[PDB]
Amino acid sequence: EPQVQFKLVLVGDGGTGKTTFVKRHLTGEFEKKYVATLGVEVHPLVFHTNRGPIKFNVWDTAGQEKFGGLRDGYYIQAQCAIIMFDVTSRVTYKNVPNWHRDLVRVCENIPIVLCGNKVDIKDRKVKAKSIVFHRKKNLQYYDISAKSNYNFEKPFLWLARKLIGDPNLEFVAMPALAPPEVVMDPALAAQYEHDLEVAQTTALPD
């Protein structure tokens, strides 16, 4: 029962991991294939806190120019944003100001998190020292990795604390309702059986 909804616009260069970051929160998966986002894809993310469930409607925008779609048209009535770049690609960090400029042009003083993704990669190109844009604009910065989940919840915890005005806000265990005993559909029984056989021949991702 979400107490509040917030529109969150996720922006950044193509390939920086925006869609992978959102899918990780949505389903827990790590999608390895890069399929460019076409325009935007909107996904809800609910987090339970000591002050109730909080829903973020995440507008995952396209980073590729050719697939931009509405571009800044997606930002209308946005209450917060995440700017993502890749710490293994200096050009993605070089364009962070342009993304920030486009955001503030439409939304002005909304809370914004700057995220340097793919810190799991050894050959890091954008060193922690070279990241100074958050200081020049008063943004919150986090190193993150959607592959290793390093700090992958910090951007939402911080945005939540800023939007709710509660410095002590914490994520808490969502209620785990005891499930009912369901009898499985005998009609789809043969389908469940085939899926299990194929699954037993396929190995886990890592």
Next chain:
Amino acid sequence: GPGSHFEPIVSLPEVEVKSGEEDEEILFKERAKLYRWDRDVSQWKERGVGDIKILQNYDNKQVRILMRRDQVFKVCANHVITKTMELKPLNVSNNALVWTASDYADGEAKVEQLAVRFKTKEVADCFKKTFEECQQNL
């Protein structure tokens, strides 16, 4: 910029959130990586990483599996253990077990093929033992 300025803030009241586990006994609690089979692309997809629990209700003796993700604490597995479930090794991976369940992690029942991977073979063997001990006591 620096200095005074107005921001829209939504104030919320404190709430006592119950985990739903208060009336259950922990029979098993170990770290694990859970996977879910996606039949549309024929892949095992990571489903969550955290502590997977075998819980038993004190009063009605019902046994279920429950797991929560790290850092976000969201449910990635929630289903009762039945006598018809078959917990088998995943031969093509190491220290992995597979079984089918009607899961409620996302708020509604979905039949899913799940795979759980533990740190050691020893922990995996202890999970399979506790799992099958609950089945025999059904």
